[PDB]
Specification:
This is part of a larger assembly, with chains A (about 50 residues), B (about 70 residues), C (about 100 residues), D (about 120 residues) and E (about 100 residues).
Chain B: no helix or strand
Chain C: E1 3-11, H1 14-18, H2 20-28, E2 39-40, E3 44-48, E4 65-69, E5 71-78, H3 82-86, E6 95-100
Chain D: H1 9-20, H2 27-34, E1 41-43, H3 52-61, E2 101-103, H4 113-119
Antiparallel strand pairs in D: 1-2
The chains are: A alpha+beta (about 50), B little secondary structure (about 70), C alpha+beta (about 100), D mainly alpha (about 120), E mainly alpha (about 100).
Chain B binds two RNA strands through loops.
PDB class: ribosome
Keywords: mammalian, SRP, translocation, translation, ribosome
Entry title: Structure of the engaged state of the mammalian SRP-ribosome complex
Chain lengths: ~50, ~70, ~100, ~120, ~100
RNA sequence: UAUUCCCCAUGAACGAGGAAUUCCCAGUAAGUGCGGGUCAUAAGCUUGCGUUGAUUAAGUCCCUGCCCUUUGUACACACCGCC
RNA sequence: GAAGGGCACCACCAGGAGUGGAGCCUGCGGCUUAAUUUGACUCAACACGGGAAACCUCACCCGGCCCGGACACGGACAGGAUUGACAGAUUGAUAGCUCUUUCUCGAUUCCGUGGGUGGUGGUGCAUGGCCGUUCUUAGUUGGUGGAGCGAUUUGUCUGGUUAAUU
């Protein structure tokens, strides 16, 4: 067990979607780390309700 | 797309050599074992650890496979 | 004992927070002591604005995902009974309750 | 069940040393086990081309840290240690010759370890 | 009956010790909560357990990248016979109820 | 393969934009920063926010495109048709 | 390119603001390029895929490593299946990935066969969901009647009204 090495510490190497491990359009804010779609799926359940 | 030409040098997938390995063990008359050649400095490879002649290489194989030098 | 207790009520549901908030006033005033009624902090609006579209295309429409979080808090002075009565009763929905010891 | 038939008293100690992870299993690890207290019990092959290899065993075995047995045949000497992955239901599993292991840390205790190491140290 | 012996023999006996073994799908952990004497992340765990299911001596869920390894009644035999463990054994689901 | 920033240094076209065409009526257009989002690094990007805050329509279908009604239709892959 | 009615500043009028001109930004097109992966083609494709990318991203090219070949089914007891190898030839790499040497884990290993397992491979004219839009436009539907043998039709409308069969 050796070699699989870089900065996996910053850069999107590191961070990915908690639901589906895709690595774009990522809701970093507010300690979510969902992909932007994985919001609208896991959104009502979270608590973000569309008001206005 | 392309279809891969490959510069005609189809690289070798290689066998790690066959080798019975342990015949060369000097049993001088009664039961007693020790030959001499070159040695490695490691701990799990404790003193018995054993070396060579190649086109250069020499290696030591006894912190399981952890630790081959550079000669 | 009589110590400077703060109860910090943080929840999302305004109605299901102010049934609890009222029950702490009416729970303490039953066994009267002191209070300084419910304080009203600014409500924090957790506002996210993502594209409606998965993938690229269509005229650019986004949603406006919101979550509120109103904080009430209620000061009081009591022993380790009146705290452990008033806090454990009037729980239930999605309501978080803090209990500060005194002053800091 | 498990009351020791013929040549199956070494088999449970080898099968439990196998699975307890610690078999100094060959001329090399056997001799580096016999060189230390790493050695304990063993099963040598009667049949042996250039019997210098059985002699290196015997000579080390016969020192303090007293070992031995005998077990006839090269062609049997492994299938009561560990060496088969199940592939094929009727076990035709494997097939070359077999030779000198060094059984370390027995397995736990009992089963065949009060049979063979009370019977070997005191063959009476 | 495979791979790094020290690590994988410990993964079996972890799973026999427990009713359920959760994980994460992440090759780059060098650890896993409870056990992890050494390294043995996903890989050594997965490689073992994704063997166990396919032969049949464990059953899955997945649920937001994690692997939901639930121990099968047939596996009770496979792993205790792997681990020579006592014919009572009692894995973990002893379960005093009421 | 000026990352981003600073400090120097060089120091361009543009003196209101040819054919076209979108935006909208009140705290509206415009300017104006500022947050957020994007971020290790970082925005000329968007989405919000005030702030300064105008002119002008307040009607019509004249162009474009929409609704109903009546009607004609050899169109029903519906006129970007059929022939 | 019929007619009445009605309506929208993605229409106009009345303007301002611009926009279209310059430089610059970055969006695409093309050429060029080994590579400038790529989706997206009027409108409802063009700072849009949250698409501000050194490395990751990343798939793509010039290489080059690595195996993470589950699983079973087969093959491999030992003169140890090759688990895993500290100085140099090298190589980019202190990649035993490979050319001797060998010293350990030690029942793992390796080689077949079937079979997977993935794949930011393919196909959005094989689909789910989600989105875009025809279209914040006024529309759509049935129960009972009444009309049509019956598809169908009225109810669902001349006019006044209304942001809006309201």
């Amino acid at each position: 067990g050796f070699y699989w090495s870089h900065p996996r510490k910053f850069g999107q190497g590191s961070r990915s979607c908690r639901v589906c491990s895709n690595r774009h359009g990522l809701i970093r804010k507010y300690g979510l780390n969902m992909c932007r779609q994985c919001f609208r799926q896991y959104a009502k359940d979270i608590g973000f309700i569309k008001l206005d | 797309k392309k279809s891969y030409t490959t510069p005609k040098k189809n690289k070798h997938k290689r066998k790690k050599v066959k080798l019975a390995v342990l015949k060369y063990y000097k049993v001088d008359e009664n039961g007693k074992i020790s030959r001499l050649r070159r040695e490695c400095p490691s701990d799990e490879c404790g003193a018995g650890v054993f070396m060579a002649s190649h086109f250069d290489r020499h290696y030591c194989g006894k912190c399981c496979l952890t630790y081959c030098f550079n000669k | 004992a009589i110590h400077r207790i703060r109860i910090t009520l943080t929840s999302r549901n305004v109605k299901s927070l102010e049934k609890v908030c009222a029950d702490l006033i009416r729970g303490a005033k039953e066994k009267n002591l002191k209070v300084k009624g419910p304080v009203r902090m600014p409500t924090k609006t957790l506002r996210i604005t993502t594209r409606k579209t998965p993938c690229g295309e269509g005229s650019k429409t986004w949603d406006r995902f919101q979550m509120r979080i109103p904080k009430r808090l209620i000061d009081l002075h009591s022993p380790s009974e009146i705290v452990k009565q008033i806090t454990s009763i009037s729980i239930e929905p999605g309501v978080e309750v803090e209990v500060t010891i005194a002053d800091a | 069940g498990g009351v020791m038939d013929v040549n199956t008293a070494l088999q449970e100690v080898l099968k439990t040393a196998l699975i307890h992870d610690g078999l100094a299993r060959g001329i090399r690890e056997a001799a580096k086990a016999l060189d230390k207290r790493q050695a304990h019990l063993c099963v040598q092959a009667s049949n042996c081309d250039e019997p210098m290899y059985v002699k290196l065993v015997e000579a080390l075995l016969a020192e303090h840290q007293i070992n031995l047995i005998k077990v006839d045949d090269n062609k049997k000497l492994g299938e009561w240690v560990g060496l088969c992955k199940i592939d094929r239901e009727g076990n035709p599993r494997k097939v070359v010759g077999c030779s000198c292991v060094v059984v370390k840390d027995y397995g736990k205790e009992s089963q065949a370890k009060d049979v063979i190491e009370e019977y070997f140290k005191c063959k009476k | 009956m495979l791979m790094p012996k020290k690590n994988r023999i410990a993964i079996y006996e972890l799973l026999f010790k427990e009713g359920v073994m959760v994980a994460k799908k992440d090759v780059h952990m060098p650890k896993h909560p409870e056990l992890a004497d050494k390294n043995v992340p996903n890989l050594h765990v997965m490689k073992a357990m994704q063997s166990l299911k396919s032969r049949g001596y464990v059953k899955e869920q997945f649920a937001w990248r994690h692997f939901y390894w639930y121990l099968t009644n047939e596996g009770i035999q496979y792993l205790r016979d792997y681990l020579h463990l006592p014919p009572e054994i009692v894995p973990a689901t002893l379960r005093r109820s009421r």
